[PDB]
DNA sequence: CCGACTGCGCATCAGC
DNA sequence: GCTGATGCGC
DNA sequence: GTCGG
């Protein structure tokens, strides 16, 4: 792709000040400006050229001038060879260890692969399942995989209720040929913003999946949100399936279009257009878009029949999901 | 210059 | 137990 | 780190 050299090293930057520095408007900031030069649809040649974009300024400009003409960038050089950093980096790409663990381990001394495995008594619950797969949860999924990941949740979904509606979101609706995980938005028609008519919708849900031996561990698990691990079945003789990382998320019923604009993604988009709708003055949740008051507050749940009125409410065309990859 | 930066579920911890 | 703040991940 | 007012 083409500006590859210029935003991997602003995702290394972005990366170190979230995980070492813990400076996440700095992360945030890297993250936008490797973002809008990942869209821009010439080869970039100069800093000055870069700053005209937005998110790009006068710091990340002068980054960009040395790393067109040395091939590198001399503060990632540094940052790759002081050994805390590295280990800290190192440490957060356990799902579950974040900065702060990441840099509690530091200071006790547990610094490789090998001292996390020494080590389990330490790791949460959380922690443990992400060391335990940590080299399958580094593996993306091919498209085909996720068609049947796809057809085994929704099939079996359906021997539950046949009125969930359940929908894989994430980068497998943006039409990537790969995803990271599996996202998968659950809709219930007795579980609305206006009632909770079934207890346990999410539960029995979960439960169906782990009876045939789909879902094969539990993060984290609460009445909306499961995050987890599953795995495809493999054929006799035939190398075992990587595990793969699951989140399954119940929105009410009637908040669907609102939930799967915030599942398909991406991120940055998500948080690019909320942004935009704060200054069309809306919020945009997972659930609802709400217009903010003279006071800043929050005002009523507007009314969405689709996923384009949201885009219609805060003057943006509409975009199709393939064209949210930001 | 400088306030503001997207929004939220679940796990965990502190303090009561 | 609850509440509120924080970590972590989406 | 960037930027809109
Ligand atoms: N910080 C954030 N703010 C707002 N929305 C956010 C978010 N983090 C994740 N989301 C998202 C949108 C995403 O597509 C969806 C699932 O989040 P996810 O982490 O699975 O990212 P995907 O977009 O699916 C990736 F492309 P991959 O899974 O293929 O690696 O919820
Ligand atoms: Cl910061
Ligand atoms: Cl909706
Ligand atoms: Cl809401
Ligand atoms: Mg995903
Ligand atoms: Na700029
Ligand atoms: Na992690
Ligand atoms: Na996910």
Redesign the pocket.
Known sequence: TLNGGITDMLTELANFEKNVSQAI??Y???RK?ASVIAKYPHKIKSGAEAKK?????????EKIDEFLATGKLRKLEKIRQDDTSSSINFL?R?????????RKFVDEGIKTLEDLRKNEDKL???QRI?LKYFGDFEKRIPREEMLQMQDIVLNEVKKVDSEYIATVCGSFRRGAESSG?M?VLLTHPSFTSESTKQPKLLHQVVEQLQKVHFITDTL??????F?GVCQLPSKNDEKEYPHR?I?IRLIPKDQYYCGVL?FTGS?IF??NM??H???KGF?????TIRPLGVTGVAGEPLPVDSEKDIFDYIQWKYREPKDRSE
């Open positions: 408007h700095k945030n900031a890297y400006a974009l937005p998110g790009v300024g006068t710091k990340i400009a957060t356990v799902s579950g260890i974040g900065p702060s663990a990441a949460n619950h959380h992400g995980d996202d984290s698990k609460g009445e909306t949100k995050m990382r989140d915030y991120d998500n948080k909320r942004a709708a704060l200054e919020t945009i949740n997972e659930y």
